[PDB]
Design an enzyme around this catalytic site. Structure first.
Site, PDB file in Angstrom:
ATOM      1  N   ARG A   4      -0.776  -8.816  -1.242  1.00 34.43           N
ATOM      2  CA  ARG A   4      -1.069  -8.799  -2.679  1.00 34.43           C
ATOM      3  C   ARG A   4      -0.371 -10.004  -3.320  1.00 34.43           C
ATOM      4  O   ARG A   4      -0.895 -10.586  -4.263  1.00 34.43           O
ATOM      5  CB  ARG A   4      -0.535  -7.518  -3.330  1.00 34.43           C
ATOM      6  CG  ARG A   4      -1.282  -6.264  -2.946  1.00 34.43           C
ATOM      7  CD  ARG A   4      -0.441  -5.095  -3.376  1.00 34.43           C
ATOM      8  NE  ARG A   4      -1.001  -3.792  -3.033  1.00 34.43           N
ATOM      9  CZ  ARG A   4      -0.662  -3.080  -1.966  1.00 34.43           C
ATOM     10  NH1 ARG A   4       0.179  -3.576  -1.066  1.00 34.43           N
ATOM     11  NH2 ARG A   4      -1.159  -1.864  -1.791  1.00 34.43           N
ATOM     12  N   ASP A  15       1.833   4.585  -4.872  1.00 34.61           N
ATOM     13  CA  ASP A  15       2.645   4.703  -3.639  1.00 34.61           C
ATOM     14  C   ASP A  15       3.356   6.066  -3.577  1.00 34.61           C
ATOM     15  O   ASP A  15       3.377   6.722  -2.518  1.00 34.61           O
ATOM     16  CB  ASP A  15       3.674   3.559  -3.567  1.00 34.61           C
ATOM     17  CG  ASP A  15       3.030   2.197  -3.770  1.00 34.61           C
ATOM     18  OD1 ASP A  15       2.639   1.897  -4.906  1.00 34.61           O
ATOM     19  OD2 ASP A  15       2.882   1.457  -2.780  1.00 34.61           O
ATOM     20  N   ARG A  43       0.800   8.807  -2.946  1.00 33.62           N
ATOM     21  CA  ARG A  43       0.454   8.750  -1.513  1.00 33.62           C
ATOM     22  C   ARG A  43       1.582   9.427  -0.707  1.00 33.62           C
ATOM     23  O   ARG A  43       1.309  10.259   0.154  1.00 33.62           O
ATOM     24  CB  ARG A  43       0.263   7.301  -1.046  1.00 33.62           C
ATOM     25  CG  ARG A  43      -1.076   6.722  -1.491  1.00 33.62           C
ATOM     26  CD  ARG A  43      -1.181   5.276  -1.088  1.00 33.62           C
ATOM     27  NE  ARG A  43      -2.541   4.744  -1.222  1.00 33.62           N
ATOM     28  CZ  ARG A  43      -2.814   3.514  -1.636  1.00 33.62           C
ATOM     29  NH1 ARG A  43      -1.830   2.683  -1.949  1.00 33.62           N
ATOM     30  NH2 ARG A  43      -4.074   3.086  -1.684  1.00 33.62           N
ATOM     31  N   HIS A  87       5.132  -2.745  -5.587  1.00 29.02           N
ATOM     32  CA  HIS A  87       3.915  -2.051  -5.172  1.00 29.02           C
ATOM     33  C   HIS A  87       3.341  -2.981  -4.040  1.00 29.02           C
ATOM     34  O   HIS A  87       2.513  -3.878  -4.272  1.00 29.02           O
ATOM     35  CB  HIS A  87       2.917  -1.882  -6.334  1.00 29.02           C
ATOM     36  CG  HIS A  87       1.547  -1.467  -5.891  1.00 29.02           C
ATOM     37  ND1 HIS A  87       1.325  -0.239  -5.282  1.00 29.02           N
ATOM     38  CD2 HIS A  87       0.388  -2.167  -5.889  1.00 29.02           C
ATOM     39  CE1 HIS A  87       0.038  -0.208  -4.996  1.00 29.02           C
ATOM     40  NE2 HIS A  87      -0.566  -1.347  -5.324  1.00 29.02           N
TER      41      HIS A  87
HETATM   42  O1  2B4 Z   1      -5.013   0.994  -3.697  1.00 31.09           O
HETATM   43  C1  2B4 Z   1      -4.011   0.175  -3.750  1.00 31.09           C
HETATM   44  O2  2B4 Z   1      -2.980   0.315  -3.113  1.00 31.09           O
HETATM   45  C2  2B4 Z   1      -4.222  -0.988  -4.711  1.00 31.09           C
HETATM   46  O3  2B4 Z   1      -5.610  -1.021  -5.161  1.00 31.09           O
HETATM   47  C3  2B4 Z   1      -6.010  -1.988  -6.059  1.00 31.09           C
HETATM   48  C4  2B4 Z   1      -5.486  -2.040  -7.351  1.00 31.09           C
HETATM   49  C5  2B4 Z   1      -5.927  -3.013  -8.238  1.00 31.09           C
HETATM   50  C6  2B4 Z   1      -6.889  -3.918  -7.823  1.00 31.09           C
HETATM   51 BR1  2B4 Z   1      -7.514  -5.238  -9.040  1.00 31.09          BR
HETATM   52  C7  2B4 Z   1      -7.406  -3.882  -6.538  1.00 31.09           C
HETATM   53  C8  2B4 Z   1      -6.960  -2.908  -5.654  1.00 31.09           C
HETATM   54  C9  2B4 Z   1      -3.883  -2.311  -4.041  1.00 31.09           C
HETATM   55  O4  2B4 Z   1      -4.658  -2.889  -3.291  1.00 31.09           O
HETATM   56  O5  2B4 Z   1      -2.721  -2.750  -4.375  1.00 31.09           O
END
Ligand code: 2B4
Ligand code: 88S
Ligand code: 88S
Ligand code: 88S
Ligand code: 88S
Ligand code: 2B4
Lengths: 330, 330, 327, 330
Positions: free
Chosen positions: B104, B164, B167, B191
């Site tokens: 990310r 997180d 999850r 994150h």
């Molecule tokens: O599910 C996750 O963990 C997150 O999902 C997203 C959050 C915002 C956007 Br824009 C794209 C993916 C990540 O990929 O960080």
């Protein structure tokens, strides 16, 4: 073990869910059905089935990760129909979907072939389920699911014109500056090009829009209300051209029907069912008419009073569907 | 007109929304945030903004077609930020998303450049809004949005570790046969890869899991609870590898934060905020710590008592983010 | 302090505040229904009986864990009601066994002479929702005392009578009341009007299948459904002493339309002068579009000559009472 | 008939409720339970039972008149228990209520005599029901319902300390400026004077309040957190003195338990169960401890780790409750 130091078990539970829903197909339609049902707290168990292993698993894990924000304690998936055992409602969204410009009727053989494998597998694990058909052409595929399943007609439902009527009520609402909940109108027949707007029943607070404008929905209508029905017909084609498919509105439409079934509401919905014995129809034609929907599926049909032109349009929709229906190989 | 024969207008229509929400970006994340917010009845108006005209219109139209099943009477869209006017909450999901095997953190240059256009346009039309950052890397992007906006730090919130922790709670729940709602546990920091599982605070009914099993979260643990944190870290990558992206769980995590903001709940969430002055962190680092969230955003920060190893891991996460952040130009 | 050791404070008005005036059975049913529909970020309660007021507020506060309304407040002092978007008045003498709601009029007018200026002082831009009986006259009275424009003074009116009618129609047909359409207009009382011409299922006029529908000559005597609607409160009062649950749900239904700016249509009390053939400043229920600014529009229902005469009779009955009133 | 002209019947009755709830007693507690259950959409059928015919009918009718605003299509009542047939949950609220200055333990003889009639009549018609006891003294009455019904322990639940813990969390929340959802703490033992605040488990975001203030809950406490537990103990009596009875908070607490049961949530609640075998308790004592609650009632019990002082207070509560149990005449 940590679980045992923390918790003392009293009994080994039966585990059989009381309000289980299965969604067959994890495409855009199936997943929109899944999220809507989860956010409406309709089920104690959600099961997903598909043929693409990675996509099925990815979709199941992504819903599971949101469990804290939900009230559906178990979310499962498998390519094997044993995962669907004891479902109260099984929603079929699997198969080919319309491409840009493609008629829903064009998906017929491909989807009848897919339904030949799916339907016996659903029936095997949930012999008492209600079947909710979403896959297209929905009317013909509800007939197919009925014939294959061997289930009585009350337990085999097609999403039909529930969405067509929701679209109609939204557009009418936009024209009048009234919430669609207070705008009433029925779109019947095929969930496609041959659908019928019932102008005689279009109203707000029980005031017939046709009593104020006798020319409502005709070529001579100065405000051209027929364009509202044309927008209903064209909507899915217009959305597919723009975003490549439709998902949100059908997902909400399906969860609306799932809510009536699961909660035994006995609300009236324009959904696909056998119309043999109505409006002079002598054949096993499946198309949308207003149905009372509850825990046993379709228990009753509302006999709508159609003008001769409205009845002729409905019999035309019936003839179009029966032409394909009567010659199916299965 | 038919409308005038049917309805007598008694008040001049000068409509200003009171609980408007805007979602920036109509990719899978933005649309999952939109459907989740619509189904939670959090807004009286929903606005969508994107740069792909067709895709934007298609998504708007598909949501509008479900209006009958919702309680959000106005759904609008435009490439133009005037459509977002008077929002109380603006959710930012736009920008590049990580590919399989991509951090990310690698989206930072692309997303900072995009934020330079989006952020000033949002604040221009919604001077009272809270900014809810979802785009990645969320921690660095919250800092960036804060610096660009001219908003006070309480009004610039990053979705951070809310997902997180959800999850983690789901996984803990699966292992214990307890609903995630009754499984408590905090994943803090970035994150991303350097997130910190706070094992010392992991509990069911106030019972510390680490007290029953001291080796909890270490390599010496016979039950390997560290694999729960590894699964939390790997989850977005695993789901991306399986379905191409993640959408549902992030959608629900964002709607959860939107509910605490819109309803002024003052619930505690692990979200991105400035941590300068805490745990000896001296730089303008934004990362997740448990925050009280309400109508004015982050009003308070909870001071978690971390073990020496948990604190060192949190300072390491801060260092990782600073290493990327300190080299930014905007 | 433990709070300072635990939390670092970084930042030292409600946005969707609702006030319920009156902590009687009606007021508390409105209060619970509003809390359970998540319509407000702050609920305020007002009454004159200090102990009863505090006890009701505390009882609601103790359930806070199971709600999403983070501030529940109360006082006899109207300063507690400041910044309300919606103020619901349920206070005054309540309908008694075997007695018309019209028998409470003068006592409820005198009480409104105190309540209304106090509400207006603290929330000058609120929507006033009148529930107290006789609701149609008291809505007119609240309108006159407040000085508010007519859109912001709403009476709960016939929203409940229509709900009762749709439930009763639903029971006869074996259909959920949501799928049974039909409007009861005019007085929320004995002179209410069943609009048989609009009664329908799936757009199907019941009058088309039974032309005598609702008349004396109706072989199925559907007029008895409206008779049941009229008698309902008297029957419930006789059995349990008062009515509360159905009215609380009907009021929360109106509060939802107002708070969420739904623009749904409700048969609620509004100024009907110049509409439906009435020349006096009478308030009664007609189908209204209800949203964030209260009643913005009125649906002009096509009434049969019988229905129009009954609505005129309802207007005459209310005007007759209102005429001989002092305020 | 008009119905036959409008509706074609296609099926065939078989109306068996799938998610039925019964509420025994239509006093203020019973009606607050009924309205809360209805507004949470937990049931497809609601049955009310009482001995006062007029009061029962008037309450039923008043709920029925609100049906348009609800999603529970069948609301029934009778003094005859055959009306409760096929309930998944039976809530007992009947009996004498305590006066100011009167212990809940003083209600024992009057309430046991009433339970001797209610319990056999309830269990007779509902093979699948869970028994949820609300009447006081709740712990003693859960033991009484368990002995009379002959039901296994998992199926007999007392509303116990669910409300005491909610009050504790609300009061803690008020002191800290945090929503009760984010304030964690357990009040266990008797739902009465001998309840035990579990200070060792009291936390915000996993942070032990006692770890910050070791004197928390003792007479040496500068902030006198013991006054919070005292306010919990006195709460029903304070509310009874002000309005004559308590109804709203208990109604909501019971609907919370009904939700965990009906939706098989497996959430943890402090509710009355048999504690024989825990904390050296050798007798069939019923009292509140954290329980995992679902479709088969209490399937599991959390073994909360207590300090020696907390354990001594819990055994003292058990001894008091066991003393009253030895006074029961079956
Ligand atoms: O599910 C996750 O963990 C997150 O999902 C997203 C959050 C915002 C956007 Br824009 C794209 C993916 C990540 O990929 O960080
Ligand atoms: C024999 C077969 N069983 C299945 C089961 C699921 C699916 N899955 C989809 O069709 C998802 C995509 N389709 C749409 N319309 O969303 C295909 C097949 S083929
Ligand atoms: C200057 C710019 N303004 C915008 C606004 C929206 C979007 N839309 C997306 O990026 C959605 C797809 N991406 C994800 N992450 O879902 C891109 C840009 S570029
Ligand atoms: C000058 C006055 N201000 C108030 C305010 C509240 C109340 N409260 C009730 O009347 C509640 C009981 N009544 C019903 N109808 O429920 C009475 C008065 S008198
Ligand atoms: C043999 C008996 N069966 C019943 C059933 C119900 C009730 N009803 C109440 O006790 C309602 C009032 N009490 C509270 N606690 O609200 C009393 C009896 S006596
Ligand atoms: O408020 C409370 O704590 C409780 O309320 C009631 C519980 C059961 C019945 Br029946 C009546 C009141 C209590 O009195 O224990």
């Amino acid at each position: 073990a940590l679980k045992d130091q923390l918790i003392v078990n009293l009994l080994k539970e039966e585990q059989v869910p009381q309000n289980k829903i299965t969604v067959v197909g994890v495409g855009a339609v199936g997943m929109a059905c899944a999220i809507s049902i989860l956010m409406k707290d309709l089920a104690d168990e959600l099961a997903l089935v598909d043929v693409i292993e990675d996509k099925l698993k990815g979709e199941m894990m992504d819903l599971q990760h949101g469990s804290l924000f939900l009230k559906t304690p178990k979310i499962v998936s498998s390519k094997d129909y044993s995962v669907t055992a004891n479902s109260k409602l099984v929603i079929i969204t699997a198969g080919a979907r319309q491409q840009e410009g493609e008629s829903r009727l064009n998906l017929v053989q491909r989807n009848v072939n897919i339904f030949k494998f799916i339907i016996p597998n659903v029936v095997k694990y949930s012999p008492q389920c209600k079947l909710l058909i979403v896959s297209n052409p929905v009317d013909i595929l509800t007939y197919v699911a009925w014939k294959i399943s061997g289930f009585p007609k009350n337990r085999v439902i097609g999403s039909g014109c529930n969405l067509d009527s929701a679209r109609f009520r939204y557009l009418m609402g936009e024209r009048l500056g009234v919430h669609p909940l207070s705008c009433h109108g029925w779109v019947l027949g095929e969930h496609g090009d041959s659908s019928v707007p019932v102008w005689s029943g279009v109203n707000v607070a029980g005031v017939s829009l046709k009593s104020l404008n006798p020319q409502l929905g005709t070529d001579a209508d100065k405000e051209q209300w027929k364009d509202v029905h044309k927008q209903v017909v064209d909507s899915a084609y217009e959305v597919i051209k723009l975003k490549g498919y439709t998902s949100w509105a059908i997902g909400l439409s399906v969860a609306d029907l799932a809510e009536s079934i699961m909660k035994n509401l006995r609300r009236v919905h324009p959904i696909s069912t056998m119309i043999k014995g109505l409006y002079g129809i002598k054949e096993d034609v499946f198309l949308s008419v207003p149905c009372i929907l509850g825990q046993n599926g379709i228990s009753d049909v509302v006999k709508v009073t159609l003008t001769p032109d409205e009845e002729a349009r409905l019999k035309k929709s019936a003839d179009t569907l029966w032409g394909i229906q009567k010659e199916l190989q299965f």
